[PDB]
Design a protein around this ligand. Structure first.
Ligand SMILES: Cc1ncc(C[n+]2csc(CCOP(=O)(O)OP(=O)(O)O)c2C)c(N)n1
Ligand SMILES: [Br-]
Ligand SMILES: [Br-]
Ligand SMILES: [Br-]
Ligand SMILES: [Br-]
Ligand SMILES: [Br-]
Ligand SMILES: [Br-]
Ligand SMILES: [Br-]
Ligand SMILES: [Ca+2]
Ligand SMILES: [Ca+2]
Length: 365
């Protein structure tokens, strides 16, 4: 059953919380509004129901968390100073494989669908022009390359300080996201990369240089590794093993820096990362040399958006009221926090193995 806890603390990213605009702790203000709205809806639900109206009313707080390992480790201690947080689904699945039932998944986030990827169940087939993942990449290129990202304006792609709204369909919630593989070069180099892909010439492809995220990343490492393995069958075992024998062919960097690196021409990223990346940023994101272009090659198989997880001993009735509070806050447009992270909706997890684990496992196969 677990103990009713009259104080609930959510872990939130440290960097995010202490981040600023104008010298101001903007996110502090956002989180306080969110916490107040949360507390009011929670206790209304709580007190409207006989099953829970006699417990103590609950206060809601946040605490900064350095990174996801700290979140999951600290939740696993089951210390009431940290009761809940929201984690990337793949990383959570891998953690729970190692530590079964140690923490309790309860909330599934959803995100506004991209106009180019509104259907979850599209998977790798053969890497040709007719491949569903290749078709999405071509739709991305119509948005990012044909209408060049560098010339997008806040006004004509509806930048709202958060995302370019014009690349989304808010009326459709996606209970998934994907990674993607970018390629960059002049015309001759792009053709050579595409030829190597088409010919399944892994050595040649790989030697164009691959940028990636950390090896525990789903969307900047593992999902793309799966596509490459499924495409260039028999040519390698794992990306880590391949890198250990070919180290100058790999570098850990964000895809939006690909254009700055002359010895790298392939990069992994979240699908549509440009959609929340302001093109005016001083980092000059996605900039390429004058006679080079960056374009999508293929996206990956889909996995669930982030999952909210509780320390094990929070009372079940309280967990379910907290889940419903997320849902109702989204419905009534009182969630000032979630949409800043891409969380545009929420659902209860009814079956973690089916709804999360099996989905993740199918994608990395
Ligand atoms: C407005 C906005 N939309 C989208 C994002 C991206 N995003 C937030 S949660 C999520 C899924 C989990 O991704 P990540 O935490 O990068 O884990 P990884 O795939 O590296 O394991 C992503 C793609 C964002 N940061 N901001
Ligand atoms: Br209250
Ligand atoms: Br109340
Ligand atoms: Br109830
Ligand atoms: Br503008
Ligand atoms: Br990463
Ligand atoms: Br590396
Ligand atoms: Br990126
Ligand atoms: Ca607590
Ligand atoms: Ca260019």
């Amino acid at each position: 059953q677990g103990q009713w806890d009259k104080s609930i603390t959510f872990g939130v990213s440290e960097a995010w919380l202490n981040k600023k605009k104008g010298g101001e702790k903007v996110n502090k203000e956002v989180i306080n509004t969110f916490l107040e709205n949360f507390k009011k809806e929670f206790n209304k639900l709580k007190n409207a129901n006989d099953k829970t109206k006699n417990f103590d009313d609950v206060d809601f707080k946040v605490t900064p968390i350095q990174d996801f390992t700290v979140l999951l480790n600290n939740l696993s201690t089951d210390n009431p100073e940290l009761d809940f947080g929201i984690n990337a689904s793949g990383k959570l699945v891998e953690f729970l494989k190692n530590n079964p039932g140690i923490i309790t998944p309860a909330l599934e986030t959803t995100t506004n669908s991209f106009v180019f990827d509104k259907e979850k169940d599209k998977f790798y087939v053969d890497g040709t022009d007719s491949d569903p993942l290749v078709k999405i990449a071509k739709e991305i290129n119509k948005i990012f390359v044909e209408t060049p990202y560098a010339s997008w304006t806040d006004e004509n792609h509806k930048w709202n300080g958060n995302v370019y709204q014009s690349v989304y369909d808010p009326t459709v919630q996606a209970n998934f996201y994907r990674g993607m593989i970018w390629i960059k070069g002049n015309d001759e180099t792009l053709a050579k990369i595409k030829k190597a892909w088409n010919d399944k010439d892994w050595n040649t492809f790989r030697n164009f240089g691959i940028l990636h995220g950390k090896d525990n990343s789903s969307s900047k490492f593992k999902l793309e590794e799966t596509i490459l393995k499924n495409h260039f069958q028999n040519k390698f075992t794992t990306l880590n093993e391949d890198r250990s024998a070919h180290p100058n062919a790999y570098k850990q960097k964000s895809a939006d820096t690909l254009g700055t690196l002359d010895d790298f021409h392939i990069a992994f990223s979240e699908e549509g990362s440009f959609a929340w990346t302001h093109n005016k940023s001083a980092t000059k994101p996605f900039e390429t040399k004058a006679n080079e272009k960056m374009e999508a090659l293929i996206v990956t198989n889909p996995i669930p958006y982030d999952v909210g997880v509780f320390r094990k001993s929070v009372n079940q009735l309280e967990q379910n009221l907290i889940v419903q509070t997320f849902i109702n806050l989204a419905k009534n447009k009182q969630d000032t926090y979630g949409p800043l992270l891409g969380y545009n909706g929420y659902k209860k997890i009814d079956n973690f193995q089916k709804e999360i684990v099996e989905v993740y496992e199918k994608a990395i196969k």
